[PDB]
Amino acid sequence: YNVFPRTLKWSKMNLTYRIVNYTPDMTHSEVEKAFKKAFKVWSDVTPLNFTRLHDGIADIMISFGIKEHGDFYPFDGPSGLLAHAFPPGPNYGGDAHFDDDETWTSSSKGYNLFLVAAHEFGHSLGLDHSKDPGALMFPIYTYTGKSHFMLPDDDVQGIQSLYGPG
Amino acid sequence: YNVFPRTLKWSKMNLTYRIVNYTPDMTHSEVEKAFKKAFKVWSDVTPLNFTRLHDGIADIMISFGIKEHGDFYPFDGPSGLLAHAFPPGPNYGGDAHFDDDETWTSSSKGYNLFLVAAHEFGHSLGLDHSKDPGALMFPIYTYTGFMLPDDDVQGIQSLYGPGDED
Numbered sequence: 001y002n003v004f005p006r007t008l009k010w011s012k013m014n015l016t017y018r019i020v021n022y023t024p025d026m027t028h029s030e031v032e033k034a035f036k037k038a039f040k041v042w043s044d045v046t047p048l049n050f051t052r053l054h055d056g057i058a059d060i061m062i063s064f065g066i067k068e069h070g071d072f073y074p075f076d077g078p079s080g081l082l083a084h085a086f087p088p089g090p091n092y093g094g095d096a097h098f099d100d101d102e103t104w105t106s107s108s109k110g111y112n113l114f115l116v117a118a119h120e121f122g123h124s125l126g127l128d129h130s131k132d133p134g135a136l137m138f139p140i141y142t143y144t145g146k147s148h149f150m151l152p153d154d155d156v157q158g159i160q161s162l163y164g165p166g
Numbered sequence: 167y168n169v170f171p172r173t174l175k176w177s178k179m180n181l182t183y184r185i186v187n188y189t190p191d192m193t194h195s196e197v198e199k200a201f202k203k204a205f206k207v208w209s210d211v212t213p214l215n216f217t218r219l220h221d222g223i224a225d226i227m228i229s230f231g232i233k234e235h236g237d238f239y240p241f242d243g244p245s246g247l248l249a250h251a252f253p254p255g256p257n258y259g260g261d262a263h264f265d266d267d268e269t270w271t272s273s274s275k276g277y278n279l280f281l282v283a284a285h286e287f288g289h290s291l292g293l294d295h296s297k298d299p300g301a302l303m304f305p306i307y308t309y310t311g312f313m314l315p316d317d318d319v320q321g322i323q324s325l326y327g328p329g330d331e332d
């Protein structure tokens with residue numbers, strides 16, 4: 001017999017990402033900074049490294065879309081689903097999609113892209129939702145208001161159980 | 167924290183299904199009986215339970231379609247592809263589609279709906295194809311006036327355990 005094997009984690013520590021397109025809501029620079037910071041959340045506590053490609057195929061393809069956007073997991077207009085990411089693997093695996101019917105922001109006027117991305121990249125790297133209400137991987141968006149972010153121990157332990165410490 | 171499971175499986179033992187529409191070829195009752203019996207093949211050897219929903223969103227959405235029918239796997243008219251099902255997951259995950267350009271039957275004529283469905287639900291639950299020519303999960307259709315072969319028993323129990331063994 002055969003089962004459908006899940007890639008519990010990336011086989012390699014060096015991963016690439018590409019920002020395929022950009023939301024109207026923020027400047028290119030703000031979007032770039034948010035995603036770079038979101039990846040750094042996870043690379044700061046593991047041996048994972050992330051490099052940005054501008055062209056061609058990358059491990060983690062990032063894009064903004066609405067409704068049906070090419071994977072038959074359609075978004076739903078404003079509210080509800082904000083974004084989704086595929087677990088580690090080839091092709092769509094690792095990819096992260098953001099619903100552009102949401103308002104994305106570098107601050108608090110809408111959904112903070114950095115925070116949502118950091119959460120979604122968790123999925124991209126092999127983490128499921130946490131039951132710890134304080135964890136980044138807890139399935140509820142919140143915005144602290146503070147200009148610095150500390151990855152909670154629950155997420156540190158989860159990601160390091162897959163990849164080890166930095 | 168939680169990491170993603172080792173292989174594609176349902177995280178719950180109680181699953182729902184919905185027969186979204188019906189083939190012209192068989193009565194409603196015949197179709198319901200075939201699907202009910204196909205689920206029992208798997209519930210009989212695991213702790214899984216299946217409950218039918220008449221409307222709304224079920225884990226395993228069942229439908230008959232032709233050609234393009236809402237996914238990346240268009241059917242192809244008579245012969246060739248008969249059916250397909252998606253591995254456990256959200257949305258289209260677990261769903262099973264049957265090509266209604268085929269003749270579906272509750273006999274040895276045409277394609278026996280029970281047998282094809284029993285195979286497709288294997289996929290819905292996380293089994294891929296087996297190399298065992300006599301396995302239910304063998305990819306090529308064959309007709310039998312059922313007992314689940316051991317290869318399939320071992321596969322499905324590797325995912326969900328045996329349930330009540332006697």
Ligand SMILES: CCOC(=O)c1cc2cc(C(N)=O)ccc2[nH]1
Pocket residue numbers: 082115116119120134135136137138139140141142143144
């Ligand atoms: C609905 C999916 O869940 C998130 O998108 C999500 C964002 C987020 C931010 C924090 C935080 N500000 O620490 C904690 C948990 C979080 N979950």
Ligand SMILES: CCOC(=O)c1cc2cc(C(N)=O)ccc2[nH]1
Pocket residue numbers: 248249250281282285300301302303304305306307308309310
């Ligand atoms: C979509 C094509 O349907 C199958 O792939 C398929 C049905 C089937 C029935 C038996 C059996 N007679 O038990 C064995 C193997 C089988 N494979």
Ligand SMILES: [Ca+2]
Pocket residue numbers: 058059060061089090091092093094095
């Ligand atoms: Ca990818």
Ligand SMILES: [Ca+2]
Pocket residue numbers: 075076077078079080081082099101102
């Ligand atoms: Ca939405």
Ligand SMILES: [Ca+2]
Pocket residue numbers: 023024025099100101102103104
């Ligand atoms: Ca927007």
Ligand SMILES: [Ca+2]
Pocket residue numbers: 241242243244245246247248265267268
């Ligand atoms: Ca066909």
Ligand SMILES: [Ca+2]
Pocket residue numbers: 224225226227255256257258259260261
């Ligand atoms: Ca489904």
Ligand SMILES: [Ca+2]
Pocket residue numbers: 189190191265266267268269270
């Ligand atoms: Ca037909």
Ligand SMILES: [Zn+2]
Pocket residue numbers: 069071073084097
């Ligand atoms: Zn998507």
Ligand SMILES: [Zn+2]
Pocket residue numbers: 119120123129139
């Ligand atoms: Zn999430």
Ligand SMILES: [Zn+2]
Pocket residue numbers: 235236237239240250263
């Ligand atoms: Zn289909």
Ligand SMILES: [Zn+2]
Pocket residue numbers: 285286289295305
């Ligand atoms: Zn198959």
